[PDB]
Write a protein that holds these residues in place. Sequence first.
Motif, PDB file in Angstrom:
ATOM      1  N   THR A  15       0.834  -1.197   0.000  1.00  0.00           N
ATOM      2  CA  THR A  15       0.000   0.000   0.000  1.00  0.00           C
ATOM      3  C   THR A  15       0.871   1.250   0.000  1.00  0.00           C
ATOM      4  OG1 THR A  15      -1.987  -0.909   1.049  1.00  0.00           O
ATOM      5  CG2 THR A  15      -1.512   1.356   1.542  1.00  0.00           C
ATOM      6  N   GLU A  16       2.093   1.112   0.502  1.00  0.00           N
ATOM      7  CA  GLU A  16       3.025   2.226   0.534  1.00  0.00           C
ATOM      8  C   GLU A  16       3.622   2.392  -0.849  1.00  0.00           C
ATOM      9  OE1 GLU A  16       2.140   4.225   2.730  1.00  0.00           O
ATOM     10  OE2 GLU A  16       4.210   4.847   3.123  1.00  0.00           O
ATOM     11  N   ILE A  17       3.783   1.262  -1.523  1.00  0.00           N
ATOM     12  CA  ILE A  17       4.301   1.235  -2.870  1.00  0.00           C
ATOM     13  C   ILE A  17       3.255   1.812  -3.810  1.00  0.00           C
ATOM     14  CG2 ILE A  17       4.641  -0.382  -4.786  1.00  0.00           C
ATOM     15  CD1 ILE A  17       6.689   0.396  -1.865  1.00  0.00           C
ATOM     16  N   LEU A  18       2.044   1.293  -3.682  1.00  0.00           N
ATOM     17  CA  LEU A  18       0.918   1.747  -4.478  1.00  0.00           C
ATOM     18  C   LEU A  18       0.650   3.216  -4.196  1.00  0.00           C
ATOM     19  CD1 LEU A  18      -1.407  -1.302  -3.783  1.00  0.00           C
ATOM     20  CD2 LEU A  18       0.175  -0.957  -5.692  1.00  0.00           C
ATOM     21  N   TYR A  23       0.278   8.389  -5.633  1.00  0.00           N
ATOM     22  CA  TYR A  23       0.372   9.737  -5.096  1.00  0.00           C
ATOM     23  C   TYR A  23       1.353  10.573  -5.921  1.00  0.00           C
ATOM     24  CZ  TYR A  23      -2.276   9.926  -0.709  1.00  0.00           C
ATOM     25  OH  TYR A  23      -3.272  10.003   0.236  1.00  0.00           O
ATOM     26  N   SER A  24       2.644  10.328  -5.714  1.00  0.00           N
ATOM     27  CA  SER A  24       3.712  11.016  -6.438  1.00  0.00           C
ATOM     28  C   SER A  24       3.331  11.237  -7.888  1.00  0.00           C
ATOM     29  CB  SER A  24       5.009  10.208  -6.358  1.00  0.00           C
ATOM     30  OG  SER A  24       6.111  10.963  -6.833  1.00  0.00           O
ATOM     31  N   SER A  27      -0.557  13.230 -10.719  1.00  0.00           N
ATOM     32  CA  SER A  27      -0.730  14.167 -11.822  1.00  0.00           C
ATOM     33  C   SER A  27      -1.135  13.430 -13.096  1.00  0.00           C
ATOM     34  CB  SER A  27       0.561  14.954 -12.058  1.00  0.00           C
ATOM     35  OG  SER A  27       0.286  16.320 -12.316  1.00  0.00           O
ATOM     36  N   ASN A  28      -0.766  12.154 -13.178  1.00  0.00           N
ATOM     37  CA  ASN A  28      -1.089  11.334 -14.341  1.00  0.00           C
ATOM     38  C   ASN A  28      -0.782   9.862 -14.066  1.00  0.00           C
ATOM     39  OD1 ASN A  28      -2.203  11.136 -16.856  1.00  0.00           O
ATOM     40  ND2 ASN A  28      -0.405  11.868 -17.982  1.00  0.00           N
ATOM     41  N   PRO A  29      -1.502   9.249 -13.111  1.00  0.00           N
ATOM     42  CA  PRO A  29      -1.302   7.847 -12.751  1.00  0.00           C
ATOM     43  C   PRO A  29      -1.958   6.886 -13.747  1.00  0.00           C
ATOM     44  CG  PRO A  29      -2.996   8.808 -11.342  1.00  0.00           C
ATOM     45  CD  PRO A  29      -2.566   9.883 -12.310  1.00  0.00           C
ATOM     46  N   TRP A  53      -7.376  -0.928  -5.230  1.00  0.00           N
ATOM     47  CA  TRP A  53      -6.677   0.222  -4.654  1.00  0.00           C
ATOM     48  C   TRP A  53      -6.803   1.463  -5.521  1.00  0.00           C
ATOM     49  CZ3 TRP A  53      -3.382   4.094  -5.402  1.00  0.00           C
ATOM     50  CH2 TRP A  53      -2.804   4.701  -4.281  1.00  0.00           C
ATOM     51  N   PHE A  54      -6.434   1.326  -6.785  1.00  0.00           N
ATOM     52  CA  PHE A  54      -6.482   2.442  -7.715  1.00  0.00           C
ATOM     53  C   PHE A  54      -7.914   2.741  -8.135  1.00  0.00           C
ATOM     54  CE2 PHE A  54      -1.861   2.467  -8.411  1.00  0.00           C
ATOM     55  CZ  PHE A  54      -1.569   1.258  -7.805  1.00  0.00           C
ATOM     56  N   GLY A  55      -8.775   1.734  -8.044  1.00  0.00           N
ATOM     57  CA  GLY A  55     -10.169   1.923  -8.399  1.00  0.00           C
ATOM     58  C   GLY A  55     -10.825   2.986  -7.539  1.00  0.00           C
ATOM     59  N   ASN A  56     -10.360   3.095  -6.297  1.00  0.00           N
ATOM     60  CA  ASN A  56     -10.879   4.081  -5.358  1.00  0.00           C
ATOM     61  C   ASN A  56      -9.995   5.323  -5.354  1.00  0.00           C
ATOM     62  OD1 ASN A  56     -12.172   4.441  -2.122  1.00  0.00           O
ATOM     63  ND2 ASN A  56     -13.372   3.616  -3.830  1.00  0.00           N
ATOM     64  N   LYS A  57      -8.733   5.150  -5.738  1.00  0.00           N
ATOM     65  CA  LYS A  57      -7.799   6.259  -5.794  1.00  0.00           C
ATOM     66  C   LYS A  57      -8.089   7.118  -7.013  1.00  0.00           C
ATOM     67  CE  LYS A  57      -4.825   6.659  -2.402  1.00  0.00           C
ATOM     68  NZ  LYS A  57      -5.055   6.171  -1.014  1.00  0.00           N
ATOM     69  N   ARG A  58      -8.682   6.500  -8.030  1.00  0.00           N
ATOM     70  CA  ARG A  58      -9.063   7.221  -9.231  1.00  0.00           C
ATOM     71  C   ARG A  58     -10.304   8.064  -8.936  1.00  0.00           C
ATOM     72  NH1 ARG A  58     -10.479   3.639 -11.714  1.00  0.00           N
ATOM     73  NH2 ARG A  58     -11.861   4.042 -13.498  1.00  0.00           N
TER      74      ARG A  58
END
Length: 64
Positions: A15-18, A23-24, A27-29, A53-58
Amino acid sequence: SSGHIEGRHMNKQATEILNEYFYSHLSNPYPSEEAKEELAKKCGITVSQVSNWFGNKRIRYKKN
């Protein structure tokens, strides 16, 4: 440095990797099927761990 108390589901520092990854790169994940699978199989977890993870981060974890 600061924070502590973080480790539940999503492998160890996955999760820290993801997170640190998306995060970082907020701007364009949009980690394509390759990147997603990569990170997923990179930790030895399961894409759904990534897939979700990204499904909710998006969702734009910013100001809505």
